[PDB]
Amino acid sequence: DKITFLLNWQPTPYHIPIFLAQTKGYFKEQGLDMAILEPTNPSDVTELIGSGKVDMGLKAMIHTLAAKARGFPVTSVASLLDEPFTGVLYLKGSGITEDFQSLKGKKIGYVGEFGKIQIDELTKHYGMKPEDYTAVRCGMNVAKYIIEGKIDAGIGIECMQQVELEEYLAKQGRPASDAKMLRIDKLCCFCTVLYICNDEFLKKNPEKVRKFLKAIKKATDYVLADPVKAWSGYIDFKPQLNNDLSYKQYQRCYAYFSSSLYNVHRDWKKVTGYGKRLAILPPDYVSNYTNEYLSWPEPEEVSDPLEATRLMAIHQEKCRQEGTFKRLALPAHHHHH
Amino acid sequence: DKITFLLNWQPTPYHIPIFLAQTKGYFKEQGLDMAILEPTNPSDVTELIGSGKVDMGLKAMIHTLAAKARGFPVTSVASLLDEPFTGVLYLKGSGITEDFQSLKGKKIGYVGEFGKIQIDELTKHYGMKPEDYTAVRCGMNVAKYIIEGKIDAGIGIECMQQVELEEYLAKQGRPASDAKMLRIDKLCCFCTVLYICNDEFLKKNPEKVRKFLKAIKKATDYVLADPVKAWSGYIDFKPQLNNDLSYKQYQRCYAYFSSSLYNVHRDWKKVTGYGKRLAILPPDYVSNYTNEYLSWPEPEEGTFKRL
Numbered sequence: 214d215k216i217t218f219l220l221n222w223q224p225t226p227y228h229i230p231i232f233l234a235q236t237k238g239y240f241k242e243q244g245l246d247m248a249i250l251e252p253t254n255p256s257d258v259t260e261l262i263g264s265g266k267v268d269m270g271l272k273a274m275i276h277t278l279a280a281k282a283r284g285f286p287v288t289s290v291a292s293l294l295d296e297p298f299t300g301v302l303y304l305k306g307s308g309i310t311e312d313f314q315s316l317k318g319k320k321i322g323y324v325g326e327f328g329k330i331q332i333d334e335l336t337k338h339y340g341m342k343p344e345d346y347t348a349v350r351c352g353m354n355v356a357k358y359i360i361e362g363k364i365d366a367g368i369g370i371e372c373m374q375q376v377e378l379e380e381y382l383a384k385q386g387r388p389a390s391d392a393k394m395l396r397i398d399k400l401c402c403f404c405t406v407l408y409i410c411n412d413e414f415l416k417k418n419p420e421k422v423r424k425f426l427k428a429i430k431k432a433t434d435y436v437l438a439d440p441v442k443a444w445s446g447y448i449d450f451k452p453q454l455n456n457d458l459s460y461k462q463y464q465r466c467y468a469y470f471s472s473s474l475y476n477v478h479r480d481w482k483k484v485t486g487y488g489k490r491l492a493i494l495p496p497d498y499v500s501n502y503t504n505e506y507l508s509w510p511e512p513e514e515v516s517d518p519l520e521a522t523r524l525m526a527i528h529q530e531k532c533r534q535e536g537t538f539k540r541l542a543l544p545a546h547h548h549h550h
Numbered sequence: 551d552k553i554t555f556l557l558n559w560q561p562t563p564y565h566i567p568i569f570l571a572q573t574k575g576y577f578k579e580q581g582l583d584m585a586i587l588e589p590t591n592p593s594d595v596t597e598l599i600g601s602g603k604v605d606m607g608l609k610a611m612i613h614t615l616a617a618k619a620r621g622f623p624v625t626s627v628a629s630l631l632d633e634p635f636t637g638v639l640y641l642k643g644s645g646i647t648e649d650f651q652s653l654k655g656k657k658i659g660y661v662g663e664f665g666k667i668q669i670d671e672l673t674k675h676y677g678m679k680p681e682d683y684t685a686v687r688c689g690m691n692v693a694k695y696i697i698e699g700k701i702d703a704g705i706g707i708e709c710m711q712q713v714e715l716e717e718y719l720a721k722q723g724r725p726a727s728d729a730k731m732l733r734i735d736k737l738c739c740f741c742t743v744l745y746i747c748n749d750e751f752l753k754k755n756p757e758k759v760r761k762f763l764k765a766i767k768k769a770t771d772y773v774l775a776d777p778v779k780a781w782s783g784y785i786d787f788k789p790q791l792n793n794d795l796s797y798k799q800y801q802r803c804y805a806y807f808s809s810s811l812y813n814v815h816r817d818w819k820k821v822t823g824y825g826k827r828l829a830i831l832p833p834d835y836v837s838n839y840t841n842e843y844l845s846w847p848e849p850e851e852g853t854f855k856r857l
């Protein structure tokens with residue numbers, strides 16, 4: 214009667230709400246016995262949860278969509294990390310540039326399956342063809358392989374892998390700005406990180422899932438309210454995260470955490486479209502999420518998505534150079550009709 | 551159709567055979583798709599495997615025995631780390647001494663469950679009573695809490711936690727000998743680390759288990775034969791183990807690796823007796839191992855050297 218929860222990755226700073234929910238006893242106060250597990254290989258994750266072998270866990274939006282398409286019955290019941298900047302990371306001097314064509318003849322790292330597909334597909338739109346480049350499967354070590362020169366560039370998230378590149382550059386006395394990204398968010402939200410359930414587990418235990426999300430919500434509020442105290446609680450439990458890199462990653466992630474846990478209807482509509490178009494998704498495919506098990510009201514709708522993206526970009530820079538914890542203040546949406 | 555394999559701990563240097571069997575493709579050459587998982591809490595482990603939620607994994611002998619007793623159908627099919635030195639670790643100046651009585655009024659860390667029971671029980675034999683001491687559950691952080699002063703002593707393995715204390719001492723310029731253990735040869739195979747199977751999974755998949763053990767055996771031979779090459783393969787995959795502490799731990803573990811994977815009939819006989827006696831095991835309890843799935847003969851009853 215323990216409930217298996219499988220992370221999408223080795224412990225990261227953004228996993229803080231799950232671990233705090235455990236260590237602070239919020240799961241216990243809901244009468245839940247969670248067994249948090251960590252994958253050795255992120256690609257095992259959708260298959261294990263989809264097949265019922267694991268009850269719940271986390272995976273990105275693009276992968277959660279493709280999971281149902283490939284016949285793994287999973288449903289997103291909430292959102293953890295909202296729309297982090299994803300792209301092809303590289304160091305200045307790679308010599309890769311904003312010219313997508315500069316990827317020609319380069320070794321490019323992707324984590325598992327979908328990213329490669331993502332680049333296979335972008336080449337056609339830039340007059341390139343696979344293989345004008347060599348794709349290299351890297352699992353959880355994309356950043357590491359860029360730093361070690363085993364690849365020229367690689368796919369990653371701004372608040373995780375980019376921060377790893379920047380910390381390396383700092384050790385070399387090079388400026389942070391030498392860590393550059395070719396954003397895919399402008400070639401979005403594929404890499405939103407979701408709480409997902411096995412479909413039959415969800416059918417059979419809706420009350421437990423609802424209680425889970427309450428515990429998570431309590432921990433998420435704590436982390437947003439008191440990030441510093443939260444962090445020290447986390448790294449006492451998970452000493453592997455007790456370093457400056459993890460802490461910096463944590464600060465960059467702060468602005469991306471979902472405060473309401475709601476699945477964003479627009480984000481899914483966008484991503485389902487993109488995926489449908491890439492033959493990953495059947496033409497009649499329906500988005501596999503629900504907000505039924507969230508026990509609190511939903512917030513006002515997304516405004517100026519490009520505006521927010523631009524504003525977020527600016528915000529994340531201030532975060533890097535100031536070392537702060539600030540949520541992106543957002544002007545509410547004006548309806549002209 | 552992936553097979554879930556749950557480690558007994560965060561990745562350690564002694565998990566190297568498993569990871570190498572994966573990264574070197576030995577699991578693949580047997581037509582196995584293993585999903586190696588890591589626990590966040592070692593105590594979840596027997597219950598998850600016992601209940602069938604996870605197919606296979608690792609666990610110490612004392613825990614694997616108590617799992618069946620507590621109604622979790624698990625069976626040991628092979629052995630990984632043989633009889634590492636287990637005991638109460640402490641720093642000289644704690645001030646704890648070889649006198650078990652010195653544990654009086656001290657904070658003593660235990661990993662999760664059986665560790666506490668082991669000390670509750672040893673006190674009765676030393677005229678002490680729980681609680682002449684405070685037991686503190688520490689999970690995977692016993693050494694860390696000793697170093698940080700949050701506990702005075704704690705239960706651990708010589709090649710893992712003790713090495714962690716020693717590396718701390720070296721950072722302080724203190725001698726390694728200041729990391730001391732009260733060894734639980736105070737009545738050491740409880741902490742032998744076993745490959746274990748869910749019973750029903752074993753019933754329904756004996757050919758796969760046999761093939762798993764073959765991949766493991768191949769990796770195990772590689773590690774013993776070429777420990778240095780093996781290590782760099784490991785830490786390329788698992789960069790969290792790329793540090794001097796992990797490498798030192800690895801060298802201490804090397805002598806303890808089981809080279810044949812066989813369950814040792816004597817070790818189990820001893821441990822089953824101990825467990826029966828303190829009330830951890832029913833009087834009619836039968837050891838839950840088998841060497842049936844091993845496909846090779848049983849052998850006769852800063853360096854890398856086998857003993």
Ligand SMILES: *Cc1c(COP(=O)(O)O)cnc(C)c1O
Pocket residue numbers: 558559592593595608609610613660661662663664665666741
């Ligand atoms: C499960 C496990 C533990 C936890 O056991 P307790 O003594 O009950 O804390 C400790 N060490 C190892 C190696 C384990 O596998």
